[PDB]
Structure 1
Amino acid sequence: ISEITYSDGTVIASIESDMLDYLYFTTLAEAQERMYDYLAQRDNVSAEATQKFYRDLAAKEIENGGYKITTTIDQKIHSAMQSAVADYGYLLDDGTGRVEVGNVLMDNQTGAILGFVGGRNYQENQNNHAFDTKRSPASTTKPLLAYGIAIDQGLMGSETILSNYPTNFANGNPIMYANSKGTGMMTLGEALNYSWNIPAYWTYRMLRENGVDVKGYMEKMGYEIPEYGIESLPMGGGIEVTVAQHTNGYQTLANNGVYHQKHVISKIEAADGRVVYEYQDKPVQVYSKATATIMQGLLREVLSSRVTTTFKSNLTSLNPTLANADWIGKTGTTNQDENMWLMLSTPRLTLGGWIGHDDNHSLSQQAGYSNNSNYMAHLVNAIQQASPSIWGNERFALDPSVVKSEVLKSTGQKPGKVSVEGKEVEVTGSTVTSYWANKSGAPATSYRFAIGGSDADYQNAWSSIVGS
């Protein structure tokens, strides 16, 4: 007689007990953590690896008591998501075995989880790849941990230049991206669309050199990272996250920089009217509104450029109308292709997606670029068939507090006079608008104008520029 229900109150199951489906265990486990804090607090503790007596009590309270447990799960969307993974799951198998999958669909204004995919098939495997397994987010780390923070601290703007010239780790090893040692200077947009690694590495070093509390940012979105003094951290080195938590970081970018904590339980009510737990809205401005809406604009291009994912193309062919909603996203690829991530938002929703194997062995080279992008387009279509207005028709837009600068294409700073080789120069050339999240906008071009680069790099780029 204790009960778990969908957001509209329809029963999911009753809870009982015995001695010897993803939806059931996920929602029960979150309901038990809610019951525990409630119990711990009503007996005024804060003491203790028992504990652990409170876990057991919370399970008993729910399996004996008569409690109504309201979830955020939308029955139609969640069922459509199961049918999707059942009908199009095979799209992910790439010749490397049975490829597993995790997907969380989150509401950007509230943090509520509308539906999810726990895996390919509960009966054949029960690991919950939406809420339990933790893998490096790799590249999908770079907007949250490196570029979004640098934009937020007034250290760069949308058309800032970064170095992708070859450079080494402190140990001598060259920093790589697939087989490439590096190219030269590029925009942010290019560093993002292609997902290069050297530009994120220099951004994070800048942040450290300037004393940015990067930990403060990540903690406010609930990320737990044990060691920040890692050179590859912007590449996802030393980080490991569930699909649900990571979706929650993209929710933050999509919601104009304002976090709401992910949840699957909204209310726990006793048969006697005692409300044991109700979700409190607790919004947190993590990035300014200028930062987040600037970041949205870049992530729009990461998908429309198709450089690292075929998603827009796949979705165009399945549902050209849905494909013209305002989609933004980032992909991620682990160093041996062990894990592929694709994160998508419209202004209303965020959908996180991971694929990999349980034993961590390698996927094919294109599992992320192609298989996962195509499977996710199917899943996005399904959610839509079930709830045709849930993705929303609104567009992401720059906040009015965003600051505009006219800069040069070649330096991403204002045109101006710099001294090169001792001998002076007047720099000019084709220009562009770059967006900033400070008061003053972009600076005037100085000698070292980009994020990173050795002296030899700057001498090579400066030279080619004065090729005017």
Structure 2
Amino acid sequence: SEITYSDGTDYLYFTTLAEAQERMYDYLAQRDNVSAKELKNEATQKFYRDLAAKEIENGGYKITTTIDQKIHSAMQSAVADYGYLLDDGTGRVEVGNVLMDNQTGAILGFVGGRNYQENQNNHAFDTKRSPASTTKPLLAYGIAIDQGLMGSETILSNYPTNFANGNPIMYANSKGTGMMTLGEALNYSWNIPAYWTYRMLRENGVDVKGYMEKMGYEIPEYGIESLPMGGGIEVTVAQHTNGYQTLANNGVYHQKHVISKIEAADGRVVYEYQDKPVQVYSKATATIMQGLLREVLSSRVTTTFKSNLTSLNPTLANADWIGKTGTTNQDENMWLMLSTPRLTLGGWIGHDDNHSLSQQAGYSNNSNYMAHLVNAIQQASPSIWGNERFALDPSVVKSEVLKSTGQKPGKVSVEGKEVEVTGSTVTSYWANKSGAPATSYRFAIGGSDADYQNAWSSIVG
């Protein structure tokens, strides 16, 4: 009886064992005609779990995993040789990563932690943590866009503002600034605009959990004001990677999996992964979203990745990389999600007890560690990342708008009066029918009464 890697023959052992055990259980139960309401009985369960365990250690099944040998060993050397770059002064830094194919959900290789021998917790598949700002594309902007409430150069308020509970909304030490583009909101990861976006989605009662649940996310309370910043959410790196699989495969989710097939010795098929593809964001949204995340990495505001990788390997650095970082407040978790059109790679770092990493752990160390990781992968499989490009889908609507309001040039009721509105203008990619609408008084997403006049008697004379 033998577990096989994609072609041929440590956390990997356990993790596979366990999925495979689970499946055998479903098959046994069902080959025995064990009834709907019998399998609820605990005792029957324990007999079947134990029976599946046994069928597998002594019955000669051929278990086929999606895992790629060369890749997954390279991801282990890479964490053995370069794991120490994660160590930032706050003790041993733990780490989890998952590589995934964007067309299939197949998981090709992962890193369960620094060293299975010193610490057995699986951080790729079992440690579960808030994702912080990397929630914002899935949950706030890609939805707003996909629902026609925004396009790529719409404006958003980052003026100081408060939670329901009175407290002010921070970004590090900043109480906030002024108005700003989606781009700038994404690249810096400002929290206020994100707050305002999710607030808008509630105001229109959008079916936000219809989106999240279609990628397999489990969030218990959708009404959290910090949700888009990651309050009220917790995920493993593997589930979360599958959320970035969705944005990268033009919005078609494919469910994450490790096992493709289990065959008895004589070919009977005990179990087969059966693709269940689901169109979560329109193609227009996912592609306008690709364009945005291309600049989160190029602009290097919240990660140094494009720099460390250009130096490690200039030609891979020119593949079409997109993604997003996250930092939970207090700095206990750092995330980097990366994608090329072919692959997604999720990475988390943190401490098993939850204390603090250093300020730069996400920004510099995980960024450079991931650059090594992404190198070791390509160096082991030179074509795997691909040389393809993310492209706006033909169905994106290109609209014609003002750098300054994000809406079409037009005239405004400037609180009793009138101005024809101008300055130079910029392309906006929209995922609706029709485009930007004509400018208006409340042009920006979110914003208080006070500030729409701070901003309008300014974005004038």
3-state SS in 2 of match to 1:141 = helix
Q: Indicate conservation of the 8 Å contact 1:9/1:70, yes or no.
A: no
State how far apart, in whole Å, the 1-side matches of 2:446 and 2:179 are. 9
Measure how far apart 1:46 and its partner are.
6.5
State how far apart, in whole Å, the 2-side matches of 1:433 and 1:64 are. 63
Relative distance call for 1:46 and 1:183 in structure 2 (3 A) is farther
State how far apart, in whole Å, the 2-side matches of 1:212 and 1:360 are. 34
Equivalent position of 2:19 in the other structure: 30
State how far apart, in whole Å, the 2-side matches of 1:42 and 1:449 are. 62
Relative distance call for 1:50 and 1:416 in structure 2 (3 A) is farther
1:143-181 Cα distance to aligned partner (Å, 9 max, x none):
000000000001100001011001100110001110101
3-state SS in 2 of match to 1:144 = helix
1:251-284 Cα distance to aligned partner (Å, 9 max, x none):
0000000011111100100012210111112211
Measure how far apart 1:36 and its partner are.
2.1
1:37-88 Cα distance to aligned partner (Å, 9 max, x none):
2233334557458634433232122123221001111100001000000000
User: Which of 172, 178, 183 is the aligned partner of 1:189?
Assistant: 183
Equivalent position of 2:279 in the other structure: 285
Equivalent position of 1:351 in the other structure: 345
Relative distance call for 1:232 and 1:268 in structure 2 (3 A) is same
1:353-405 Cα distance to aligned partner (Å, 9 max, x none):
00000000000000000000000000100001101111100000000000010
Aligned-residue CA RMSD in angstroms? Answer: 1.1
State how far apart, in whole Å, the 1-side matches of 2:2 and 2:211 are. 38
State how far apart, in whole Å, the 2-side matches of 1:380 and 1:364 are. 23
User: Which of 449, 454, 458 is the aligned partner of 2:448?
Assistant: 454
Q: Indicate conservation of the 8 Å contact 1:290/1:401, yes or no.
A: yes
Q: Give structure 1 stretches of 5+ with no counterpart.
A: 11-20
3-state SS in 2 of match to 1:53 = helix
Measure how far apart 1:312 and its partner are.
0.4
Is 1:100 paired with 2:94? Answer: yes
State how far apart, in whole Å, the 1-side matches of 2:25 and 2:339 are. 33
3-state SS in 1 of match to 2:176 = coil
State how far apart, in whole Å, the 1-side matches of 2:367 and 2:342 are. 20
Equivalent position of 1:3 in the other structure: 2
User: Which of 452, 456, 463 is the aligned partner of 2:457?
Assistant: 463
Q: How many residues align?
A: 456
Relative distance call for 1:222 and 1:44 in structure 2 (3 A) is farther
Equivalent position of 1:17 in the other structure: none
Relative distance call for 1:189 and 1:89 in structure 2 (3 A) is same
Pick which of 243-252 and 36-45 moved more.
36-45
Q: Indicate conservation of the 8 Å contact 1:342/1:353, yes or no.
A: yes
Relative distance call for 1:377 and 1:39 in structure 2 (3 A) is same
Q: Indicate conservation of the 8 Å contact 1:77/1:383, yes or no.
A: yes
Pick which of 417-426 and 130-139 moved more.
417-426
Q: Give structure 2 stretches of 5+ with no counterpart.
A: 37-41
Measure how far apart 1:445 and its partner are.
0.7
State how far apart, in whole Å, the 2-side matches of 1:181 and 1:298 are. 25
Q: Indicate conservation of the 8 Å contact 1:139/1:195, yes or no.
A: yes
User: Which of 317, 328, 337 is the aligned partner of 1:334?
Assistant: 328
State how far apart, in whole Å, the 2-side matches of 1:225 and 1:348 are. 28
State how far apart, in whole Å, the 1-side matches of 2:95 and 2:439 are. 47
User: Which of 359, 374, 395 is the aligned partner of 2:368?
Assistant: 374
3-state SS in 2 of match to 1:131 = coil
Q: Indicate conservation of the 8 Å contact 1:160/1:450, yes or no.
A: yes
Q: Indicate conservation of the 8 Å contact 1:135/1:242, yes or no.
A: yes
TM value normalised by structure 2: 0.97
Measure how far apart 1:465 and its partner are.
1.1
Relative distance call for 1:459 and 1:51 in structure 2 (3 A) is farther
Measure how far apart 1:229 and its partner are.
1.2
Relative distance call for 1:459 and 1:45 in structure 2 (3 A) is farther
Q: Indicate conservation of the 8 Å contact 1:403/1:436, yes or no.
A: yes
Pick which of 27-36 and 243-252 moved more.
27-36
State how far apart, in whole Å, the 2-side matches of 1:454 and 1:50 are. 60
State how far apart, in whole Å, the 2-side matches of 1:345 and 1:117 are. 17
Measure how far apart 1:30 and its partner are.
1.1
User: Which of 118, 125, 145 is the aligned partner of 1:124?
Assistant: 118
Measure how far apart 1:425 and its partner are.
1.1
Q: Indicate conservation of the 8 Å contact 1:405/1:442, yes or no.
A: yes
State how far apart, in whole Å, the 2-side matches of 1:173 and 1:127 are. 36
**% identical aligned pairs:** 100
Relative distance call for 1:46 and 1:90 in structure 2 (3 A) is farther
Is 1:421 paired with 2:410? Answer: no
Equivalent position of 1:51 in the other structure: 45
3-state SS in 2 of match to 1:273 = coil
Equivalent position of 1:39 in the other structure: 28
TM value normalised by structure 1: 0.96
Q: Indicate conservation of the 8 Å contact 1:415/1:445, yes or no.
A: yes
State how far apart, in whole Å, the 2-side matches of 1:190 and 1:39 are. 54
Relative distance call for 1:272 and 1:188 in structure 2 (3 A) is same
Moved over 3 A (4+): 40-54
State how far apart, in whole Å, the 2-side matches of 1:354 and 1:36 are. 32
State how far apart, in whole Å, the 2-side matches of 1:101 and 1:162 are. 34
State how far apart, in whole Å, the 1-side matches of 2:455 and 2:259 are. 55
State how far apart, in whole Å, the 1-side matches of 2:115 and 2:182 are. 40
Equivalent position of 1:13 in the other structure: none
1:121-151 Cα distance to aligned partner (Å, 9 max, x none):
0111110000000000110000000000000
Measure how far apart 1:421 and its partner are.
2.2
3-state SS in 1 of match to 2:83 = helix
Q: Indicate conservation of the 8 Å contact 1:27/1:264, yes or no.
A: yes
Is 1:145 paired with 2:139? Answer: yes
Equivalent position of 1:82 in the other structure: 76
Relative distance call for 1:345 and 1:66 in structure 2 (3 A) is same
Pick which of 56-65 and 429-438 moved more.
56-65
State how far apart, in whole Å, the 1-side matches of 2:131 and 2:43 are. 31
